[PDB]
Amino acid sequence: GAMNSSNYAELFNNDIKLFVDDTNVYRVTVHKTFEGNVATKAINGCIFTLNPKTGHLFLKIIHTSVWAGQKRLSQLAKWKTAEEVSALVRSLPKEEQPKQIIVTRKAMLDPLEVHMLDFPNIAIRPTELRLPFSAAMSIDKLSDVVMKATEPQMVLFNIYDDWLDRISSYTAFSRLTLLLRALKTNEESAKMILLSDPTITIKSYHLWPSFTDEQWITIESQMRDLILTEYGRKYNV
Amino acid sequence: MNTVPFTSAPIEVTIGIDQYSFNVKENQPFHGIKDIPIGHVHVIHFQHADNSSMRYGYWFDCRMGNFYIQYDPKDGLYKMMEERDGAKFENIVHNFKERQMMVSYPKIDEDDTWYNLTEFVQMDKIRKIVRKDENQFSYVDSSMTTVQENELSDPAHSLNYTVINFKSREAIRPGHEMEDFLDKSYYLNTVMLQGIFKNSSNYFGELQFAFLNAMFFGNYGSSLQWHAMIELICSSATVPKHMLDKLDEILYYQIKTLPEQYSDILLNERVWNICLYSSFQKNSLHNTEKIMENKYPELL
Ligand SMILES: Cc1cc(C(=O)N2CCN(C)CC2)cs1
Ligand SMILES: Cc1cc(C(=O)N2CCN(C)CC2)cs1
């Protein structure tokens, strides 16, 4: 059934599961044509497939060529997503295949269920959480590899860097969702928070800066301020 | 014209014969139904006055034998039986006909309703859906479940309708997932029509039989089957033109015959709105769409 606040610790148990987010698969710029009509131009996209217990992020880059000559692209994008997730699962050894796949949008349920009919034991589940994974393209290294791709490509990263050496997967996911929520609510402020201090760097093999434990507590507090703020600047409170 | 005699009527009961209904009081001198049209299947069905629970009845074709009804006080119901002694039967019917002990099948001459509801329904196919091979007639009641319902518990007493499931490997070709799910023509024309049913007459026969069990017995799994078979056609972009035209006629007469007060439980809002307003065949069911909009505009 649907994943929600009541069953949140299930994400960090020892049953392999993946979140799938399709919100950055089909991406466009909207513009005027010489005749003054409106047209779209697609740009590269990505499927965001994440193991919340381990931090493994299977980033499948969606190159614009996949849309050439196709109709009803927003509908095709859900099916292309389901096709690529099914191919990923089939590529994994049996003992690494997920036992559940949680989709962040309900419109992915039927496309994924149909593509996974060969796997009747894998549960396809929606969620009641409003997870901020659309903001993954505000992570500079992820945006960079998506935009530079000249062909379809899968890149493998850990979105927790080395955090699991010092914190649990519950705490790591909480930090991740806070960072992504902040970046989604005010990208510039969030990015200022994360980089203002030039002595804290991002390792070549990492996505986020190398904060000490004490600095993460400050950072995390600053992201909560931002989110409550913007919630005032937004609603005037 | 043929006859189904009754040994007696020991318990008060509403008896229906196809779309007709009448009341028989406890121990009333009732000895059956005469003038039944030859050439059609028929259904004779029952609802006891004391327990409106369980509607039940029997599908039969008088060309296949001499059938009668006899109440059983142990099992507590009116049972259909076959009389093999043809002389014994013709004499019995004649004596009762001579004494005016039977109600006449009241077929108005202009009226093609029953033909139009049973056009493709054959006894031999009924007997494969309702398995009880020692009898030439078939018992159905309100509570019987379908083979597919049992997949989601006595198999001998099941309705073995053809399983239709839009999210199944049978329905979806590897590598055509999106194509086959959004346009079900492959599943309709290759898997079901060419492969299982063999022709559209047999498909329409099962569809009509499922409707009639839903209407006369309130059989829920039959209602599911009727709607599934409609939706499979409406959700196919490529359907033979003669099938669409015939489907429109079939559904028109089903909607025309449905009791107005049962529409809330016998009609699935989602299926009908999809079929009439969103599907590939949204513009191909002119008669059905007109009667639906004038009779059940609330549903839509
Ligand atoms: C399967 C995935 C692994 C990682 C990752 O960060 N590394 C963990 C250490 N080794 C064992 C594999 C590489 C991202 S996706
Ligand atoms: C074969 C038969 C049909 C009917 C019929 O239509 N009536 C049933 C009795 N009254 C109360 C309503 C109307 C009677 S005998």
Establish how many alpha carbons lie within 13 A of residue A61's alpha carbon, considering only the half-sphere containing its beta carbon: 21
**Rounded-to-integer distance, Cα A45 and Cα A40, Å:** 14
Instruction: Kindly state the helix (H) or strand (E) to which residue A134 belongs, with its residue range.
Output: none
Q: How far is the CA of A159 from the centre of ligand 1 (A)?
A: 10
Q: Is A76–B178 a contact, with Cβ atoms under 8 angstroms apart?
A: yes
Q: Write the residue with the smallest CA distance to atom 2 of ligand 2.
A: B22
Distance from the Cα of residue B207 to its chain's centroid: 8
B167 and A117 in contact by Cβ < 8 A? yes
Q: Is the CB of B177 less than 8 angstroms away from the CB of A110? A: no
Distances, alpha carbon B50 to alpha carbons A32, B12, B29, B55, in Å: 75, 8, 19, 12
CB atoms < 10 A from the CB of A17, how many? 21
- The Cα B140–Cα B60 span in angstroms is 11
Distance between B172 CA and the closest CA of chain A, angstroms: 8
Q: Hey, are the CB atoms on B178 and A111 less than 8 Å from each other?
A: yes
Q: Is B97 exposed, middle or buried (0-12, 13-18, 19+ CB in 10 A)?
A: middle
Sign of CA dihedral B85, B88, B90, B92: negative
CATH number, domain at B170?
1.25.40.550
Q: Pairing relation of β-strands A123-125 and A100-103?
A: parallel
Q: How far is A115 from chain B (nearest CA, A)?
A: 6
Name the structure determination technique: X-ray
Which residues are registered as beta bridge partners of A27? A43
Atom of ligand 2 nearest to the CA of B21: 3
Domains of chain A plus CATH, in order, are: 9-163 (3.30.420.230), 164-237 (1.20.80.40)
Query: Cβ atoms within 10 A of the Cβ of B67, count?
Result: 23
Q: Is B26 on the interface with A (CB under 8 A)?
A: no
CB B138 within 8 A of CB B127: yes
Q: Which residues of A touch B167 (CB under 8 A)?
A: 110, 113-114, 117
Total residues found in chain B within this entry: 300
* CA atoms lying within 13 Å on the CB side of residue A38: 3
Residues B234, B187: Cα–Cα separation, whole Å? 12
CB under 8 Å to B23, separation ≥6 — which residues?
B12, B13, B14, B15, B49
**Nearest-neighbour CA in chain A from B167: distance (Å):** 6
Helix (H) or strand (E) holding B138: strand B138-141
Q: Is B45 helix (H, G, I), strand (E, B) or coil?
A: strand
Structure tokens at A60: 């499948």
A74 to chain B: which residues are within 8 Å by CB? Answer: none
CA-based max dimension of chain A? 59
Structure token digits, residue A132: 């901020």
**Gap between the Cα atoms of A120 and B169, Å rounded:** 11
CA B40 to chain centre: 13
B154 CA from centroid of ligand 2 (Å): 36
Q: What is the resolution of this structure in A?
A: 1.6
User: Inter-chain contact B178–A117, Cβ cutoff 8 Å?
Assistant: no
CB of A54 closer than 6 angstroms to any ligand 1 atom: no
Instruction: Indicate the burial class of A129 (C-beta count within 10 angstroms; 0-12, 13-18, 19 or more).
Output: middle
Is A7 within 8 Å of A17 (Cβ atoms)?
A: no
Q: After which residues is chain B broken (C to N over 2.5 A)?
A: 152
Residues of chain B found within 8 Å of residue A83, distances taken between Cβ atoms? 177
The Cβ of residue B131 has, within 10 Å, a number of other Cβ atoms equal to 13
| Atom nearest to A158 CA in ligand 1 | 6
Residue nearest to atom 8 of ligand 1 (CA): A158
B177 touches A85 (CB < 8 A) = no
Q: Is B178 on the interface with A (CB under 8 A)?
A: yes
| Token pair of B244 as six digits | 């669409």
CA distances in angstroms from B290 to B91, B248, B252, B269, B286, listed in the order given: 50, 11, 9, 16, 6
Please give, one letter per residue, the 3-state secondary structure of B206-221: HHHHHHHHHHHHCCHH
Disruptive mutation site among A86, A113, A117, A118 for chain B (greatest number of B CBs within 10 Å) = A117
Q: How many Å apart are CA A19 and CA A204, to the nearest integer?
A: 26
Q: Is the CB of B25 under 6 A from ligand 2?
A: no
State the Cα–Cα distance between residues A53 and A96, nearest whole angstrom: 13
Residue B176: which domain range?
116-299
Q: Do B167 and A113 touch (CB under 8 A)?
A: yes
Per DSSP, the residues of B69-110 read: EEEETTTTEEEEEEE--HHHHHHHHHHHHHTT-SEEP---TT
Nearest Cα residue to A48 out of A138, A123, A111: A138
